[PDB]
Symmetry: D2
Subunit: 313 residues, 4 copies
């Protein structure tokens, strides 16, 4: 037997670069092949990342090619073409598809038959596109979806209540983006519902809470305006998902998973808490949503479905 | 500065020793002093534990004396002698011989009590020591809760870290499961059952029953139980030493919560560098509230009688 | 693909029990099957060990049988029949062989084709016996050998010099037992030889050093006399070796490996620093020993070879 | 008690930010204050880093001011502006504006210097601050050494944690490899070559050459270098905050070692909660000793001239 976990990373941007670094520091997988149009960056990054190895568990890190995905456990897609100013949502999707096909087809042709973890934006759309171009089962194609939005939502609630975010449990669902929403109904701190927390701590105005989600929804714009880009959050979420898969944990995580009736949706990948392990998506959690929240999910899905429909035609 | 975390462990039985191992393995704290009547046992144990150190971060481990608690950050009590009121009084005397000489040493860190009966001895420790309420902690239903969650996790096949459920009240027969708030990934048990009707309501009932009798069954099989509490104790320690503000089910002092007062009982609480910071008062259903009431009542009874 | 590391543990004594617990706390492997004549102990231990899971990464822990080794990555043998008083070395070996055969044959018959990690005493002898009864390649049968003796030697040197034992590098070699010896020639603290350390810190009498090894050699007797048994050390060494294999690290570790000319030895398993990974033993390090040390190795090997010879006949 | 470790980071460039991430990921320390001229950049960075916190232990991360160093355990300096003597003087002024306001805050923990030229600025920091010699540390050849070991590891296909070799002297052109003591699993390089003659002597030569020019090559490929030093810095931090007494190659003050005096230069040293405890003086060969001598000499030259 050979216990050697190999990860292929497509896209060596700040997100990919950081993701890899997060993998190094936590000792996840024993090999990372970095694939990117800019061969020099990848080469210089593989060296810089390996410089760090003697302080953690060993790995083989190198500039790779799509064929190196032959025997990979995982393929992480991270650098979608950014939306130019004045470009339509549908055109952003279409320019990425041509690029996506150019990545998926040759990886699939290498023989690769592991799990696709998509982080490229628009993530939900490109997840479904990856599933469609790869042909892989619905549960072997995962998108980061609302994992970071959810983390940001939890850290925010944690700061307000001064509690370890790992004792805070709340989700952000729907399509990653403007049309996402908070699942306040099932949000809790140590099992104590937010509602219950508020009705015991009246100092928490319903305004602060409403603004709190608004801020998570716009978190990326704020950070980009400040430091020019965002990457630590998504890189950390990506390593978390990788760990859950590679360590076969059956952990519940907000991810973009194929819809088959849940929430009253069908044939689209959208953000929802799900059980993931070595074989990809197992159980797709379906939180009994509030009428208002179900509407928010419906609206989010619908908008995404229309774009998706127009996209493939 | 003085970035040196020190732990004093009282009681070198299977629980105490297992706890020490867990601290070594996870590299929690830099020093561990083991206090116990059997000096030879503790000496062989500190050597055996130190033998593992080159495979983890370094620590100073040794057989200790109460006087060594002078500058300890934490004192962990596991020394609990095996009528309920009798059991209590024989432990109240042993506990006094531990607490007093430790307080006389100059110790003013945090007390973590794991000796049974935990809730009672947790209270007794607080009274014997004179320390502030938030600086005497008991493991309470931490282990029951972990067992409760692992059981749900196996039933549903989901990492227990994604399962959230509590066992509350006094650690013992009267403890109860807070089903009203138990959930998986935020998805309520009640709701989980609706989506998975294969899970019979009576299977849930046995599950908690099996948790309440957990110690009995284990002791019957391997003679004793210790890996669970040892791990729980080390978890509680990482929460304090790393100032996490983590929510853990611990035995804490009641000051109104659930309509109780003047007792240490099990309930979710925020903990950090300075001990208990906030006591999470879950809104229990009528059913659960009674369970909580009765458990408190019977516990307060013994408490008063004991003193 | 399926990244699920499974470990089968034979022997649920204080060593096996602790080993498993060390695996749990560090999150190594995703499944541990505990096999032992005393089915109840194993059952009660699997429950107690699992009680700890919600505080670490998940695992499947259960009382198992030899057939459960079918698809195991690793098989850890830990509870050899103890040497009764007045029993000869050769008779200790022979009573264990009958027991060993009863373990190896049915595990091999389950289909199992991973790596054998032997900790049972006498370890070096039973390692070779395991290799002989299993037929597995020489590099897929490993004995804990002098890993703990070496660790004990390093912690000892560390305490004297007050330095982190991970910055101390020294070995104990030969057959685990009375005939082992310290490799002072290549022992160093941060690269600074012991000799060099002494010739800069004259307060270190050559007496303290001589007694220091004597104490490591007799470490087990001291601890047994005190706490009645020894287990944390070996359990920790066992988890370390497991990690090196399961994480394919190519780490150098003192282990009992087949001899093919190194040190002037042949056809016996004996303690020596070696490179191990997912496929077992790779490079067998051969420290250029001192004449005196080479003699100590020769003497250790010879004694072990004679017993081994008589054993198989 | 006060089990709260605080780090103040000065310089939010790729190195500073990467270092902060490494602290978050490994869960080292409980608070991180980031000081830098670009307040907006540091604010977006603290938010971006905090976004990762729910996946690791909790921390308080924020844009900080020198005054926040009042009760910090550690101050990490990465702010180093890009003739050698000129480079030095322009950094000596920037360094002063950092050190002075931090010392005025009341800070009396440990200074970890990572800004180039590291050894010089390490010395300058010591002089500007007035702190004890063992409480001003420089990364020195920590990264060079790591790179050196990773290179040997790839050549031989062995976990670098099982490789032991140093890069010594002033971090820069004059640094040299201490081949006489370099080893793999305790098995000397010289000895390793005898057993594996395929390893040409000139391949070893290029190896160090590639280490000396490491930064150049990386910068040429990806524009900058930071993951290595970031990881090294976080390693040095875990050694202090966890009081490990670990042996690391750092820039430390010379007081006789290698026949040098009044300078901070790279060499193996024991480090812990209180900074440098012991300076490991490796018995260098004649060849290596000269290398060490010359490196010191040229460094002492600039040092004196600069001041």
């Amino acid at each position: 037997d050979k216990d050697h976990q190999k990860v292929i990373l497509v896209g060596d941007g700040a997100v990919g670069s950081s993701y890899a670094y997060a993998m190094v520091l936590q000792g996840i997988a024993q090999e990372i092949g970095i694939v990117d149009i800019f061969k020099d960056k990848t080469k210089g990054d593989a060296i810089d990342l390996s410089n760090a190895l003697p302080f953690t568990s060993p790995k083989k890190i190198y500039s790779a090619e799509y064929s190196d995905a032959k025997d990979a456990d995982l393929v992480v897609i991270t650098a979608g073409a950014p939306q130019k100013p004045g470009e339509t949502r549908l055109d952003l999707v279409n320019k990425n598809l041509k690029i996506l096909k150019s990545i998926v087809d040759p990886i699939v042709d290498s023989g690769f038959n592991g799990i696709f973890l998509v982080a490229a934006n628009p993530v939900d759309i490109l997840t479904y596109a990856t599933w469609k171009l790869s042909g892989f089962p619905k549960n072997r194609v995962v998108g980061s979806g609302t994992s970071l939005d959810t983390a940001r939502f939890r850290q925010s609630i944690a700061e307000m209540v001064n509690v370890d975010a790992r004792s805070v449990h709340a989700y952000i669902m729907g399509e990653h983006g403007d049309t996402e929403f908070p699942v306040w109904s099932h949000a809790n701190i140590g099992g104590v519902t937010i509602a219950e927390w508020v009705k015991a701590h009246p100092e928490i105005k319903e305004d602060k809470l409403v603004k709190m989600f608004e801020d998570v929804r716009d978190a990326a714009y704020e950070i980009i305006k400040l430091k020019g880009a965002t990457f630590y959050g998504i890189a950390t979420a990506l390593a978390r998902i990788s760990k859950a898969i590679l360590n076969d944990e059956n952990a519940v995580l907000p991810l973009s998973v194929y819809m088959d009736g849940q929430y009253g949706l069908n044939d689209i990948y959208i953000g929802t808490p799900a059980v993931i392990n070595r074989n990809g998506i197992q159980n797709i959690l379906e939180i009994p949503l509030t009428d208002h929240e179900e509407e928010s999910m419906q609206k989010s899905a619908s908008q995404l479905k229309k774009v998706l429909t127009d996209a493939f035609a």
